[PDB]
Amino acid sequence: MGPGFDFAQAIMKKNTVIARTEKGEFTMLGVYDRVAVIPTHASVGEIIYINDVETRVLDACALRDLTDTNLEITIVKLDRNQKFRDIRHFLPRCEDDYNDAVLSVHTSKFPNMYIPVGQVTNYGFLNLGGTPTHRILMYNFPTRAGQCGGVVTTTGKVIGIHVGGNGAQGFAAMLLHSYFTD
Numbered sequence: 001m002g003p004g005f006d007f008a009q010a011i012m013k014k015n016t017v018i019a020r021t022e023k024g025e026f027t028m029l030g031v032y033d034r035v036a037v038i039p040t041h042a043s044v045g046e047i048i049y050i051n052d053v054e055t056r057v058l059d060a061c062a063l064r065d066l067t068d069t070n071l072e073i074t075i076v077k078l079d080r081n082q083k084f085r086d087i088r089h090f091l092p093r094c095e096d097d098y099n100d101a102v103l104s105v106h107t108s109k110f111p112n113m114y115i116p117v118g119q120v121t122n123y124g125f126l127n128l129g130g131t132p133t134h135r136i137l138m139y140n141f142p143t144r145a146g147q148c149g150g151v152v153t154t155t156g157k158v159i160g161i162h163v164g165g166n167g168a169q170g171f172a173a174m175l176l177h178s179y180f181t182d
């Protein structure tokens with residue numbers, strides 16, 4: 001509908017795949033080369049389905065901060081014959097608040113879904129499903145099951161991936177440029 005949805009659509013059309021684990025279908029963001037991200041609660045194993053194709057996992061790392069606190073991001077390297085468009089220059093360098101964000105989802109159940117979530121707060125600490133979690137972004141939209149892995153963007157920035165909700169608010173794990181240096 002407008003330039004927010006334009007940037008979101010550009011990311012979804014080239015830099016997302018549908019990931020399936022034993023815990024469900026997730027929106028998965030490809031960041032560069034064969035490296036993608038997914039919420040840690042997806043429980044990635046040695047094998048994952050990517051757009052319904054059986055795919056070997058070459059590496060999977062559940063990130064924690066230097067307090068040894070959960071970040072709810074898993075970085076996955078996929079054994080596939082192609083590379084993602086490099087979108088690392090759209091990642092923020094520092095923790096921040098944002099205006100006018102879009103949450104975008106693409107699964108079998110919710111294809112081509114875009115949600116204007118509005119203002120995003122650097123919330124920080126969250127007890128997420130019983131697990132102390134840091135670097136959480138919060139938005140005042142009543143997000144429901146099926147939206148985990150959803151990409152949070154502003155115009156020109158990919159800022160997070162959706163990891164939970166409380167029925168009234170939705171929560172995303174930050175993406176930082178420093179997670180994807182090689």
Ligand SMILES: COc1ccc(C2=CCNCC2)cc1
Nearest residue numbers: 014033034078080082083084
């Ligand atoms: C490293 O694994 C990859 C990389 C890219 C893809 C994509 C397929 C179609 N649309 C673009 C993204 C799939 C798997």
